[PDB]
Amino acid sequence: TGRPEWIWLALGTALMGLGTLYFLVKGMGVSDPDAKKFYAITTLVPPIAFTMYLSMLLGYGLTMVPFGGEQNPIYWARYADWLFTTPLLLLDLALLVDADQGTILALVGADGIMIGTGLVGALTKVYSYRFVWWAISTAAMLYILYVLFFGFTSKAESMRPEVASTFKVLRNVTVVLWSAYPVVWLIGSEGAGIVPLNIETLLFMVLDVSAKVGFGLILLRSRAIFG
Numbered sequence: 001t002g003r004p005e006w007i008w009l010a011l012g013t014a015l016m017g018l019g020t021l022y023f024l025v026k027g028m029g030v031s032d033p034d035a036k037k038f039y040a041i042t043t044l045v046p047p048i049a050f051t052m053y054l055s056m057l058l059g060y061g062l063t064m065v066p067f068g069g070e071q072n073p074i075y076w077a078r079y080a081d082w083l084f085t086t087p088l089l090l091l092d093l094a095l096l097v098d099a100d101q102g103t104i105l106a107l108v109g110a111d112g113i114m115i116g117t118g119l120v121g122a123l124t125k126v127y128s129y130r131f132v133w134w135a136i137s138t139a140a141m142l143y144i145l146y147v148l149f150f151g152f153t154s155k156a157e158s159m160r161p162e163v164a165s166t167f168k169v170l171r172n173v174t175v176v177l178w179s180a181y182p183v184v185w186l187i188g189s190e191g192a193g194i195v196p197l198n199i200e201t202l203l204f205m206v207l208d209v210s211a212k213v214g215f216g217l218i219l220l221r222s223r224a225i226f227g
């Protein structure tokens with residue numbers, strides 16, 4: 001076919017593939033057991049994004065959903081990707097500040113609701129209900145951010161400054177990048193259709209890559225990962 005944003009899918013697959021190998025390589029030359037924990041988790045995040053980007057580049061994970069008088073193109077492979085990568089990122093932040101089991105389970109659960117309702121909204125045919133789902137998905141997100149900001153940050157103070165300070169950088173990159181997603185969804189293909197798919201795809205890879213490979217790098221090159 002050759003859709004305009006394939007170029008962006010091509011750069012997403014590429015960046016994610018590099019990050020994967022570099023983390024893999026760096027992670028298997030590490031003997032520390034906790035370092036090993038963070039490395040296994042993080043190195044798992046980019047490959048999952050890689051395959052989902054590949055398929056899309058190659059033509060899968062796309063479906064035409066009717067609404068607005070149009071047959072709209074929704075890249076659902078995007079959710080099959082985030083469903084597994086967002087909770088692995090949360091877990092990565094949660095292990096850092098020694099979050100409790102209830103917090104994690106709730107952060108991950110809340111995270112399950114967000115990608116699920118978001119997907120249901122991306123699939124919904126009554127135009128206005130799409131925004132209802134989008135609404136529930138976003139509120140689930142605000143709960144997660146509130147927890148990362150209010151809860152986690154507090155427990156990171158029971159950690160060394162090197163640890164509390166690697167966390168606030170990662171928590172900040174997460175608050176800023178996550179904040180953007182619901183807005184992209186809104187003004188683009190899933191929502192208003194103001195921003196065309198090709199610019200939306202570009203916006204999405206820039207965030208996906210910053211939030212994954214960007215997040216991983218900062219985390220795995222830190223000394224705070226060591227037990």
Ligand SMILES: *C/C=C(C)/C=C/C=C(C)/C=C/C1=C(C)CCCC1(C)C
Pocket residue numbers: 082085086089114115118119134137138139141177178179181182185208211212
């Ligand atoms: C590697 C991928 C990351 C860090 C993805 C983060 C994705 C989000 C924070 C997505 C959020 C969404 C909403 C708040 C509502 C509408 C639909 C979503 C799934 C785009």
